[PDB]
Amino acid sequence: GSHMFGESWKKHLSGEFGKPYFIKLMGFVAEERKHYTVYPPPHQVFTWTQMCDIKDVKVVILGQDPYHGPNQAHGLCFSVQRPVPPPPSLENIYKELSTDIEDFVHPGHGDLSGWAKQGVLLLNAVLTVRAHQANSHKERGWEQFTDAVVSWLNQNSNGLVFLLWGSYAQKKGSAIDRKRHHVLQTAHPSPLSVYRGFFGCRHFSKTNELLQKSGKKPIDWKEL
Template structure:
């Protein structure tokens, strides 16, 4: 089966695309479409995080859970919405922390593509969702795939900064070799939990300090 994904990732993940769980993902998406359901993000953007951040460019992994399920929001980058769409509450809180940590003005756009261009893999653990039904694709096999992605980054790279916000993301820590990489953990930026350890985490400046110490160019977090 031919998967349209950026070439370096295609090579690194080629064995995953042949596994039965991935066939199940493809079949599940086909059934959803056949049943008339709307899927987000659009098919050509499901692997957008990989297309925007080739494997050799990855220096930070920011892990999200599930794509936004409203019309026009999701475009394959975690926490990010398409340009012109109002930033959702979690992203608003991310911007508040960015401002207090680095003094960067609150961006007008909710599109985080510039972060992806600077080496931040904006990876959702689940890569698709049915319209208006959060976590509706959480059981179709995506996590087997994205767990493999995290393992590959851990095995084949060094000094990557993994940013894990909230318990769901932090449960993925077992996939990461902490002797080779850096792991930053905080509460989720959701309005329900941001006051419990997300605000004040200073993960943007800490990420750049860790990268600089490893001789890697820091991320330009400005949007």
């Protein structure tokens, strides 16, 4: 096998792979790759499944869709692998972390794997993008798939913190039982929207408050 989709996630989501919408979606993505550059590369569409067991997810960060520039997106929302510098969205995330978490210091890179390993699911609502065109693969099938991810977690986990960043991610909110999980919503951290509430949202400290109240270990946001 290719080992692209983590095993505990495949166990609970592989049913989607036999559904017409998903078969047609992956066909659409393959047709796009034939004529255009699509991000992330094929082996990294599902990196978000490879960092921790699905049963160990404690926090879900949901963005819009992947970065659309060369060598940026690698399947963890808002993350970029070294040596690529943090894009403007991630610099804004770091800026809010710096005011929200007193101990947080800019790490010098943009790889968020260290949050994902602690059980922060770094998901985007749409999981591919045509180069240079933000949200170009919306409404093609990804939303049903990431709905299935959110629905599984909603039903099988307890006390999750969902952070829905941007209008497209917030479409998932209706699916989440608010008396069982915690949903925090704010604007996307892109410079094009950050001033609509992201700065000052304090989601990182709020997340840890909620985890600690429910007996769970907080996220160490400096562990990158």
